[PDB]
Amino acid sequence: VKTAETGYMSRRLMKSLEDLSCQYDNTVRTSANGIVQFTYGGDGLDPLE
């Protein structure tokens, strides 16, 4: 029963967060070129590597 809810969870969790890009200032910004954050997580370091 619940996994059918989880899918909707991810899908909608995207739509607000869907386009958020890291520009070349290391300032992650919106579609409309607003600014949600200045550095990345106070860090600037990609969590992956």
Partner 1 sequence: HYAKIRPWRTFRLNECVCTPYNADFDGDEMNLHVPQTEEARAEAINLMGVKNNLLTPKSGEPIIAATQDFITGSYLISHKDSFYDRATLTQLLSMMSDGIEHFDIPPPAIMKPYYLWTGKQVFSLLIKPNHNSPVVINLDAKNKVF
Partner 2 sequence: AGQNATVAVMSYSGYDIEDALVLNKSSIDRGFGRCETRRKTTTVLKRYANHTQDIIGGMRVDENGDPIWQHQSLGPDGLGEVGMKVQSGQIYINKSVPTNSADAPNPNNVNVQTQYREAPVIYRGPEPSHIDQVMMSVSDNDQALIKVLLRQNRRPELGDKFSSRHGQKGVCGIIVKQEDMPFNDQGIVPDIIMNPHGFPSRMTVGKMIELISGKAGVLNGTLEYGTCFGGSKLEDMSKILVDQGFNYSGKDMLYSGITGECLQAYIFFGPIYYQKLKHMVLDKMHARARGPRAVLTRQPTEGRSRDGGLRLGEMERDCVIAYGASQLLLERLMISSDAFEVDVCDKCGL
Partner 3 sequence: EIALFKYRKARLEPGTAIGAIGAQSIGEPMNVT
Question: What residue ranges bind partner 1 (CB under 8 A)?
Answer: 47-49
Residues of this chain that bind partner 2 (CB under 8 A): 7, 10-11, 14, 18
29 binds, among partner 3, partner 1, partner 2, none (CB under 5 to 8 A by kind): none
Total residues interacting with partner 3, rule: CB under 8 A: 23
Residues 6 or more apart whose CB falls under 8 angstroms from that of 39 comprise 26, 27
Tell me: does residue 45 bind partner 3 (CB under 8 A): yes
CA distance linking residue 20 with residue 17, whole number of Å: 6
